[PDB]
Amino acid sequence: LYFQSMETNPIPVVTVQTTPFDDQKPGTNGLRKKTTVFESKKNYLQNYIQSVLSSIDLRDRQGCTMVVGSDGRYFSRTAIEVIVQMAAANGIGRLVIGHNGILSTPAVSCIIRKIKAIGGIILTASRNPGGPNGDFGIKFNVANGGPAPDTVIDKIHQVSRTLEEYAICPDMRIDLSRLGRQDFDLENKFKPFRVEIVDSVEVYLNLLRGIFDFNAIKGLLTGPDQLKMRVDAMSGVMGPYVRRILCDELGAPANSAVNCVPLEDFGGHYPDPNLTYATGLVDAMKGGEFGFGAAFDADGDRCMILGQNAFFVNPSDSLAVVAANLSCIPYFRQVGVRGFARSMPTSTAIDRVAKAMKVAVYETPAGWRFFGNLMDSGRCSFCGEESFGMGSDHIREKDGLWTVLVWLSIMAARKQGVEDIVRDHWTKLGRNYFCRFDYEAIDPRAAFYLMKDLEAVISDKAFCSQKFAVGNSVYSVEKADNFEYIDPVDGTVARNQGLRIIFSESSRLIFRLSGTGVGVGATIRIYAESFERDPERHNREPQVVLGPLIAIALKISDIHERTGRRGPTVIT
Ligand SMILES: O=P(O)(O)O[C@H]1O[C@H](CO)[C@@H](O)[C@H](O)[C@H]1O
Ligand SMILES: [Ca+2]
Ligand code: NA
Ligand code: NA
Numbered sequence: 001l002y003f004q005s006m007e008t009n010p011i012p013v014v015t016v017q018t019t020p021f022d023d024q025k026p027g028t029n030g031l032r033k034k035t036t037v038f039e040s041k042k043n044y045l046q047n048y049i050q051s052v053l054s055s056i057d058l059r060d061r062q063g064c065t066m067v068v069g070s071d072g073r074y075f076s077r078t079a080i081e082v083i084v085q086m087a088a089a090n091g092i093g094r095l096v097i098g099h100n101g102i103l104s105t106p107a108v109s110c111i112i113r114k115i116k117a118i119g120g121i122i123l124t125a126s127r128n129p130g131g132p133n134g135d136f137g138i139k140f141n142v143a144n145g146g147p148a149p150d151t152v153i154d155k156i157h158q159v160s161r162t163l164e165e166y167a168i169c170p171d172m173r174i175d176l177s178r179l180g181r182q183d184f185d186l187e188n189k190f191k192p193f194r195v196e197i198v199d200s201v202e203v204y205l206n207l208l209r210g211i212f213d214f215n216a217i218k219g220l221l222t223g224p225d226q227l228k229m230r231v232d233a234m235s236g237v238m239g240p241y242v243r244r245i246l247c248d249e250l251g252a253p254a255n256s257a258v259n260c261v262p263l264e265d266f267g268g269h270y271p272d273p274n275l276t277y278a279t280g281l282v283d284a285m286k287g288g289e290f291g292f293g294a295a296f297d298a299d300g301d302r303c304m305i306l307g308q309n310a311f312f313v314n315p316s317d318s319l320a321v322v323a324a325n326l327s328c329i330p331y332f333r334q335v336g337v338r339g340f341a342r343s344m345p346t347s348t349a350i351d352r353v354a355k356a357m358k359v360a361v362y363e364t365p366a367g368w369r370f371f372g373n374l375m376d377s378g379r380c381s382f383c384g385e386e387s388f389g390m391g392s393d394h395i396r397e398k399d400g401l402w403t404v405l406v407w408l409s410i411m412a413a414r415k416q417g418v419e420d421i422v423r424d425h426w427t428k429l430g431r432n433y434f435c436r437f438d439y440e441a442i443d444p445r446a447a448f449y450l451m452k453d454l455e456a457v458i459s460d461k462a463f464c465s466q467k468f469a470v471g472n473s474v475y476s477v478e479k480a481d482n483f484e485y486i487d488p489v490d491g492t493v494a495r496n497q498g499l500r501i502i503f504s505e506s507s508r509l510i511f512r513l514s515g516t517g518v519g520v521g522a523t524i525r526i527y528a529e530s531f532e533r534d535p536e537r538h539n540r541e542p543q544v545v546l547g548p549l550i551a552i553a554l555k556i557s558d559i560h561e562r563t564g565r566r567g568p569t570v571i572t
């Protein structure tokens, strides 16, 4: 098929010889390194961008569209520039980029799916700190808008470890500050290379408007009896989303929007929503003047929900509560509820809802990528993780602001505050007490032998006959395993996904090695769960209830001696 056209000042395409790197395999949620690795290690960033681009069939990449966005952290604008120069050189037809480089992770997923893009690159290190001395990360999402599957992660890795050259258009300059279209004539490309700078919020907001009853939510946030609300974006990507959606569209006063200017260092604070790091929000909620509080992580897919007086909504309870109240949402009234999913370490509170509702519930490895197949196949429409994550099949990522809007929708439909809804839920279904200990940046050698030895302990043929006593508490082993998951849709097998001990007395211990590290150090997470049926025992301190289970965990793992630590780095 023949065509003729004109070109003006075509941008040359440069081929650069390079040496492969050894460690360019992404973890659970992207390739995460210290920022200085991407910024200063020669060709480190270019090698990985080329490897990502090369995991796309050359015929499927010619004339395709990719979405690019960042959480705003230091080095994002430089990475975006390089990404645009390299996408142009590798024959990508069009890039859709958020205004000023800003696109939340839920917005990227939404836009990929909406415009049928082949995929997306999200520049974020999630809850990790930003700045020149901070962390930087590169996520790759595929055509369903969800994280890259193990199939694609391996293709990226084998391209990165053997890469010998990459292509780039170094003379290209892109203005992220102006909305609209920018076309570029490239040498040896017939069609112009197209860049669209899009409003960070508009298309994502349009999706949310069809899921939720915005009139109902607006009624809750306005008028004389209005909900008093504090929403902390932690100086990350969610700033403009909060202001445009919760304030402008839904009527919340401007003082509801806290830390809603994106900053390259997130204001010098960890953009991590929990009681340990969202101290500014907790302190304001403790004052008693607000009925609802929320904090988001850097890229807007995590959310902590607080009630009046900083009542803490455990993320595993958030999952169960919302699951039991999906009828309050227009979306789920129309399309129904096909199934639930949680990660294996997440508490089994949602399983009790699924049983009562006669709905399937799946148990996946940690990480949102495993919910993608469940949603695509229609097996599941609502899912969550203990790590402050919740989402639905509206996209293929977790979604913090969606979590806020579904909670407000439930509060409006039930005419109840946060704490009353949760306690009413506990009264109906019982309470699953739950906590997580993080042992951060421990020696990888120590972690290896710890997990190896513990696996041998819990896999011994006599372990299911064991029982443990701490004080007056007794726990009897029902089952134990090294969790594996065979994807029911595409057959991907994920092994070594957590050491799990299930006790007969409605209790669990889970041990996992982290897969989202940046540097050398390893992180071990211990999860403890205990179910309480008695409604008079639903106001105890979780660290008291779970004390004995934690004692057993620390003893059989020997973690304190093996790591030199006296206790966990973080408690959730
Ligand atoms: O470091 P980990 O435990 O492998 O992974 C952690 O971050 C992931 C990416 O946000 C979450 O999906 C997990 O639930 C969380 O535990
Ligand atoms: Ca037993
Ligand atoms: Na040209
Ligand atoms: Na700083």
Ligand code: NA
Pocket: 337, 338, 339, 340, 358, 359, 360
């Ligand atoms: Na079902």
Ligand code: NA
Pocket: 415, 416, 417, 418, 420
């Ligand atoms: Na109430």
Ligand code: NA
Pocket: 029, 126, 127, 516
């Ligand atoms: Na993480």
Ligand code: NI
Pocket: 105, 126, 127, 297, 298, 299, 300, 301, 302
């Ligand atoms: Ni995140």
